[PDB]
């Protein structure tokens, strides 16, 4: 069979495939990170410091 071959073990064509793939991955990482979580919206909306005043009388 064709894939049973020592030539296909260190195939430079697949090594180029991997190289181009992960160079493009590195280029596009900062766009993959651009998903928004709504946790700080929650923290802003729900964080309520104690607003009561002191009254000795």
């Amino acid at each position: 069979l064709i894939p049973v071959s020592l030539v296909d073990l260190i195939n430079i064509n697949i090594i180029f495939y991997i190289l181009l793939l992960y160079t493009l991955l590195l280029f596009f990482i900062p766009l993959f990170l651009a998903s928004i979580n709504y946790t700080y919206h929650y923290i802003y909306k729900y964080y309520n410091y104690n607003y009561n005043f002191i009254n000795n009388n």
Binding site: Y38, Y42, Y46, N48, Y49, N50, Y51, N52, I54, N55, N56
Partner: peptide, 20 residues
């Protein structure tokens, strides 16, 4: 489903004076 609710009234800051 905590994000789709408003329990700020269920959980309010206490009116306790620490001066006492």
């Amino acid at each position: 489903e905590c994000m789709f609710k408003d329990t700020r009234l269920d959980v309010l800051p206490p009116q306790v004076n620490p001066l006492n």
